[PDB]
C-alpha cells in the first residue's frame, strides 16, 4: 500500500511565496476568481478589482491532461506570456507559468503568478490557499 501523505499532486505554485498555492486535485474542476462561487477565492488588498469574480477554470481534459481556460476575464490569463483566447481550452505542462490579470504601473510582475508543477504533497500542503 501507500500513504496519502507520500503522494504527489499537480498544483499552481504561487511564484515568490510559500503561501497561496492552488491544488489541482485529480478528477476535480478548480475554479479561481474573487467572487464567492469559486474553488479558490483570491482576495487582493493591493488591487481588489484586478481579478474577475469568475476568472479561470482548470480541469483535466478527456485524455487526463490538466488544462486552463480564461472565463471571459476582464484583465486576462497569460500562459507563458501569451494571452489566452477567452473560453479556449489550453493544455498546461510542467514548468509553465500562468499570470492572472496584469502588472500594475511600475511593477515587473502581476500579483497572481503561478508555476504549473507536480510536487510532493509534503511540499505542497503547508503552502496551500484555503478552499473557499
Amino acid at each position: 500500500g501507500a500513504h496519502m501523505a507520500g503522494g504527489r499532486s499537480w498544483c499552481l505554485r504561487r511564484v515568490g511565496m510559500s503561501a497561496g498555492w492552488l491544488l489541482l486535485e485529480d478528477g476535480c474542476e478548480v475554479t479561481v476568481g474573487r467572487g464567492f462561487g469559486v474553488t479558490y477565492q483570491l482576495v487582493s488588498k493591493i488591487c481588489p478589482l484586478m481579478i474577475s469574480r469568475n476568472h479561470c477554470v482548470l480541469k483535466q481534459n478527456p485524455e487526463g491532461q490538466w488544462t486552463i481556460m480564461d472565463n471571459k476575464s476582464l484583465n486576462g490569463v497569460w500562459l507563458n506570456r501569451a494571452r489566452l483566447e477567452p473560453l479556449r481550452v489550453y493544455s498546461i505542462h510542467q514548468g509553465d507559468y500562468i499570470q492572472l490579470g496584469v502588472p500594475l504601473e511600475n511593477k515587473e510582475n502581476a500579483e497572481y503568478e503561478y508555476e504549473v508543477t507536480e510536487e510532493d504533497w509534503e511540499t505542497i500542503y503547508p503552502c496551500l490557499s484555503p478552499k473557499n
Binding site: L49, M50, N75
Partner: peptide, 7 residues
C-alpha cells in the same frame, strides 16, 4: 458586488 476594473 463590485464590477471588475480594467487595468
Amino acid at each position: 458586488e463590485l464590477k471588475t476594473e480594467r487595468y
